Every structure is written in structure tokens, then in C-alpha cells.
Amino acid sequence: GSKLLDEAIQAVKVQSFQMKRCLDKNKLMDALKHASNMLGELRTSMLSPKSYYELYMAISDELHYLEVYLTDEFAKGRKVADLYELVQYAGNIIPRLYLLITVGVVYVKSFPQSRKDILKDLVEMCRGVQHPLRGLFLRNYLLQCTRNILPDEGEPTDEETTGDISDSMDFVLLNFAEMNKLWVRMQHQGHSRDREKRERERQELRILVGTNLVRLSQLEGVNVERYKQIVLTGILEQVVNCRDALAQEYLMECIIQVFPDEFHLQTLNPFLRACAELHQNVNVKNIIIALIDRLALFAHREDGPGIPADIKLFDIFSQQVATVIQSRQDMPSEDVVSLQVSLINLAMKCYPDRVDYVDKVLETTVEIFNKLNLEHIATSSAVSKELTRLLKIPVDTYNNILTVLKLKHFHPLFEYFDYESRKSMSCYVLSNVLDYNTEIVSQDQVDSIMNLVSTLIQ
């Protein structure tokens, strides 16, 4: 039908009109009685996630006019007594908590002394809502209301305020852990034949859980050692133990996006040991490649520190990728090679000088192809697609193409192609050696050019 949504938004606009009407007359308890009625509409199970989201956005807009009314009313000396207590008299828990959270942030602003206790209270009393959809949106409303008022390090020096960065990190890590619990629980609610509908429904809601991680990175007082010890340890504990491929894949990629590259360099072996634990249905390849691509962009960014010499990227990634692949039960051969591509790409952008590294990936790729008792690989196969893209990166990216001919293990990978791809690839390299002019070729590299011609004609 989809009427339900409009009928609800209709009713919301009715009650929010009578709400502001009372806020003009200064009839606060009459205003809150309509605000409660409005909030009533969020109790529904009948809406889907997209519909509910729309209704939430409507009701969140109206709640802001109330919130700002109270904030100013309190700021002008005329502070309502027992207002925190009074909104809790509400019979239904959903109106009660949205009002409690609204009234909470007004109290934190207006009474800095009670900040720690109120924040700690608001996250705790949300345990009331165990229903995945409604609870997620409540716990999101908690997060967005509190955005500007959470403790930090760049704060006004008012020595009557309470709570520090430690309390901010507990506050969000707790809200995170509860929201991820609700969002994973959504997997098992409802009838068993709507599995594809649920995973679609969960996917739409993934941003709500992810917002917790985003909020943690917006904390100025989250330095690297706090990230190491508290924040990432916190996040990873939920990620490995949720045992849910959808959540694991989202949250790991969400980590990479949200936190800075400085933090990633100090947490690579922790992060990649977590990758090796993830549920088999998780695309681990995508997580690792996403990380490598972000550290590649970090290398080429000037007016920035670059990659310290103690952080041996290549040795870390080569060794972990091989361990992560070892952890998979049936990773495609094309995917294993998609990783060898990014290992090269990492070594190219992080250590252009060190050609020995580029050859070690290629040497390792040979060992991989050799280890796999491989039947002849067609050009139509995905493995061949990747091995082509792998070999094309040194050729496309280096300044002097002579330097590619100096690689010892570049050519031995041509063995495993099709007859069609040898002819195509041999041509492609030799083509580039003419398109940019040739200098006199050294002894090892004279040998290379004839080896390329031999595969082209035969």
C-alpha cells in the first residue's frame, strides 16, 4: 500500500503543528504531550527500513525545533525544573527515550557538571529497545544529538565540567557494540524465505552502525596509542566475534575509510591478523586491496611525512597476504593474483627505487602458478585477465622500459599464458620498446629482447 508512511507523516505534521503552537504560548507540558504523540509514530513495525528512515527524518526535524526551544529557554536563565525526570513519565518507551535524549543534551549544555553522568545514562537506558530496526534509529538519534557535546581535548577550560576523552571512547564503543548486535540480530528475525530481503534491508541500514566509527575518528583526543590500545581493540573485538560476513566485510572496509593513514601504519599486523579470522564468505581481497590503495595514495602525498623507514610495508604485506590466503578455504585463483597486482602496485608507489621487490612478487607469482597444478590457462579465463593486468603495470608505470627487461622473473610468467596471450603480450612489450626510442642494450637485456621475440613468433 505505502499509505501507512504518508498517513504517519500526515499525523506527524498535525502533532508538530500543535506542538509549536504550544511552544509559542509557553505551554511546555502541553507541547511535550504532542511531541510524545508525534514520536508515537516511530513505534510501528509496519514500515520497511526505507519508509521508517523517511518517517525518522521527518520526526528528527521537528524534535530539533523543540531541542533549540529548550536550549535557548535554559540559556536565558528560565530553566525548567525536573524536566529530565518529567519526560520519563511517558508510558511508551520509544517516545520516552527520544524525549529523554533530547532533554539530556539540553542538560549537558546547560549544566556542564552533569555531562559524564547524563551521557553515561543515555547510552545505558537505550538498552530498553531490543527491536533491531527501532533500536538502531534510537541509538543513531543518541549519536547525532550528542555529536557536539561529547568530551574531547580541544575543549573550553571550565573547571566545573565532567568527563574526559576516555568517557567519550567508552560512550561510542558501547553504542557501537549495541548497534552492531542489533544490526546482526536482524539476520534471524522474520520468516526464513525472506533471507535475500533481509540482507538487502540490513545493507540499507549499514550506515547507522558505521556512524559510530566515524564519530570515533572525529574525536581530536583519539591519538595513535589510544587507537592502538582502546578504539581499534574495541572495534576488532566486535568484528571478529560477530561471526557475520556482512557485518565483518562492511566494518573492516569502514575502518580503512574512516581512520587516517598514520593510524593504519601503526596497526597493520593487528588489522591483517583480523582479516585472517573473518568468516569465509567475506571478500578479504577487497579489504586488503582497499588498505593498500590508501597507503599508496599516502606515499605520493607531499607536504606530509611519507612512510617511516622502520615500517617495512612490503615485508609486512607480502607475509600477511600469504597468511590471509592460507586462512581461506576456497579463494579463487584469480583473486590470489588480484592481490599480487596490489603487492606490485604497493612496491611501485612506496619504493620505486627498489626493483628487487617488484621481481620478488613476480617470483612469488611464478611459485604460485607452479604450486597450482594448472591446466593450460585460456585468454578468456579470469586468471589470464589478472596476470595480464599484473605484467602490464611495470610496463605502463616505469619511465625507462629497459628497467623492465632487467627483471629476472618477468618473462617466466609467459609460460602459463595461452598461445593467444603470449602473442598479444610479447607484442605489447616489444611495441612499447619502439614507441619510446632504444638506447644501447646491456648484456642481460640483449638476452631479454630475443626471449620476447621467441614467444611472439612461436
Binding site: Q88, I93, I94, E124, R127, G128, V129, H131, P132, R134
Partner: protein
Amino acid sequence: FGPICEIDIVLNDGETRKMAEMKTEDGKVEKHYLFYDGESVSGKVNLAFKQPGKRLEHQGIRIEFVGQIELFNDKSNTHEFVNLVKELALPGELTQSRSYDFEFMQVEKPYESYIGANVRLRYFLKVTIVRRLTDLVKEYDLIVHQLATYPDVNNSIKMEVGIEDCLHIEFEYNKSKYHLKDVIVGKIYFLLVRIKIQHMELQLIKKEITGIGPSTTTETETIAKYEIMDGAPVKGESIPIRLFLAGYDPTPTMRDVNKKFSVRYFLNLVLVDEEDRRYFKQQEIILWRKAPEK
């Protein structure tokens, strides 16, 4: 004509003395003066004489302080637990208006005023001008509140209950005895959940028991329904309770008042499943009127 005389009572401390309210039938709210066990009641009985020229022949005027318990609105079933008399005038006449002083010294008021379904307990002053066939009578109502102090023993309620191999829970309320503007701080901890729970709520229930022995009538009224959970828990989950009793304006617990009636309060915890079946556990709590410092 009208009435020949009108009786009006005016307490000596009728300006400064605090009043209190009483919820009667159909939502009406009366306001009478507030008194406490031990206080003296004193004032003036003022007789307005209305018919000038006429005379009022009486066989004596008195004033009574009365505290009594009325059951089922049955006049034959009224029971006076306190009665004090002050004779104001001997048999005689009244040609004009006149006042009379009265004082009842340090008056015992053992019970708190209460208006229920099948019970009323009220205190009043009753002035009676006795006449040959029909007495002129004027009642004048008062509220008495019974106060108490913080209790010696106050243990938290904590209890593991359930349905075998279906639902096990542990609920805990922070006290057994709560004052009238107190707060139920509690928690529900889930140990085993093999049913599908839609929601959970705490209810406040007020039982009013009347009669003696086998003669027993209980009038129940569900004062609060307070949602505390929305959705299915799993084991290991804790749900917080914070229920402000100030919101519902209840009476104190009143146990065997004059061996005639009780008024008791209960915390009825109720979980409701997906097919609307309703699992509950009742727990009596004592309410008590706290004495404010002074």
C-alpha cells in the same frame, strides 16, 4: 422562608494552616484542612441567625470531633474509632447570632484519611443543635495524613522466576518500601529465552481489601502500565527500570486499618509474546508517606 439558623465552623489557625486534596468519585477533588496525629483542633462555632423576629428553641448545642470508617456506603456499617464531645450550650433559646469557642486537646488520629471503592475513612467536626423533632447538623471535613520515617530494614527484592525450559529471568527492584515520591530503580536479567517476546512492562497495582475473615471483597485497580522493553531479548541481556512514583499519585500502604480494610500495592512485571500470551510476576511493595524535614 429558608433555614432559621446556619452553622459555620472557623478554626483558630484557619489562615496559616496547610490544606490537602482528596480524589473522590467521578474525578472530583475536594480540599480540606490538614491535620496530624497528636495535634489539637480548636476554633469557633458561629451561628448565623437568619430570621429576625423569630426564636430558636433547642435542647442543647454540642460539637463533636469524629473519625470513622464507612463500608459499602451502608449507613448501618459505619464505625467510629474516635469520638470527642464539647457541650457548647444547655437547653434554651436563640434570638440572635452567637459564637462558641471549642478546643479538643491533643487529639489522637491513628489512621490516614482514605476514600476508596468500598471504604471511606474520614475525620470531621460535627455541630449539632438539638431540636424537638429534627436536629440541625453541620459536618466539617478534615484530612489527616499519617507520617513515617526511613525504615530500619529495607532490603532489595531479587528473584529468579520463569516457565521451565522456556523462559528464566532474574528481576531486581532496589527496595521493598518506597515513599510516595520515590523511584523504582531495577533491572530484568534474562537467563534463558526460548519464547518470542514482543514487549515487557512493569505495572503498579492497587488492591483494596474490605471485610472480616471469609467476608472479603478485593477491588483491584491497575494504576500504572510502564513499558520497559520493546523487542526480543536473548540470554545475558539486562534491561534497566526507572519508574518515578511521583507521576501516579498513589496512597500509602494501609494494612488492617481497625481490622476493617487493607490497601496494598503490587509491582506486576508482565512480558507479552508474539501470539499475545502474557507472562507475569506480582510483588508487593509497601508505600509510605515520607515526613518532610519540617
